[PDB]
Amino acid sequence: GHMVNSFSGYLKLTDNVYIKNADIVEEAKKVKPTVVVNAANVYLKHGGGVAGALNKATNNAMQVESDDYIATNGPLKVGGSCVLSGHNLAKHCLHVVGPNVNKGEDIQLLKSAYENFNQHEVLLAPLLSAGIFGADPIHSLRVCVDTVRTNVYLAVFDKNLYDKLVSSFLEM
């Protein structure tokens, strides 16, 4: 049978949102998901954070394909997305651009970002904008839970952040 989208060890937060303390790259190898989400910039230049880890795991294939896409089509809009190959990690990678709060981009665009998730049944995803782009992780989670109606399995790398998110959620 197909052991595709074989998620295990997630906490169910809502009907359609699950969360786990895991490296999204390790989850990708284990699950072989249809879609993995990248927390991208508009240039798909995969730096630190999730983007760099995903790219490193593809031996730079993601960056080469991303360079090609951007050469052809130009940059994404903040809040926008594109579907590219998941290479050796997944069938597809949904590249989504959260607002860069560190450069004072409108936090409103984080709702636009998560809206992209609704075009896909099942996603393995991180918290958009909550790392290098300097949004409050609890805010990213709230906007995710409030916006996404499809099945999202969130991977949080940092144990302490995972614990703060889960406690903060289960108080309301």
By CB under 6 A, name the binding residues for ligand APR.
23-25, 39-41, 45-53, 98, 126-133, 137, 155-158
Minimum CB–partner distance for residue 6 and ligand APR (Å)? 18
Q: How many residues does the chain have?
A: 172
Minimum CB–partner distance for residue 159 and ligand APR (Å)? 11
**Phi and psi of 107, rounded to 5°?**
-65, -25
Axis-axis angle for helices 49-57, 61-73 (nearest 10): 110
Minimum CB–partner distance for residue 116 and ligand APR (Å)? 13
Is residue 6 within 8 A of residue 12, CB to CB? The reply is: no
Task: Output 146 or 158, the one with its CB closest to ligand APR.
Answer: 158
Task: Output 52 or 80, the one with its CB closest to ligand APR.
Answer: 52
> What value, to the nearest 5°, has the Cα angle with vertex 28 and ends 22 and 30?
85
Give, in order, the Cα–Cα distances in Å from 152 to each of 51, 101, 156, 166: 18, 23, 13, 16
Task: Output 51 or 94, the one with its CB closest to ligand APR.
Answer: 51
Task: Output 24 or 143, the one with its CB closest to ligand APR.
Answer: 24
DSSP tag of 168:
H
Axis-axis angle for helices 49-57, 24-31 (nearest 10): 40
Residue with the CB atom nearest ligand APR in the bound state: 131
Minimum CB–partner distance for residue 4 and ligand APR (Å)? 20
Minimum CB–partner distance for residue 165 and ligand APR (Å)? 9
Task: Output 48 or 74, the one with its CB closest to ligand APR.
Answer: 48
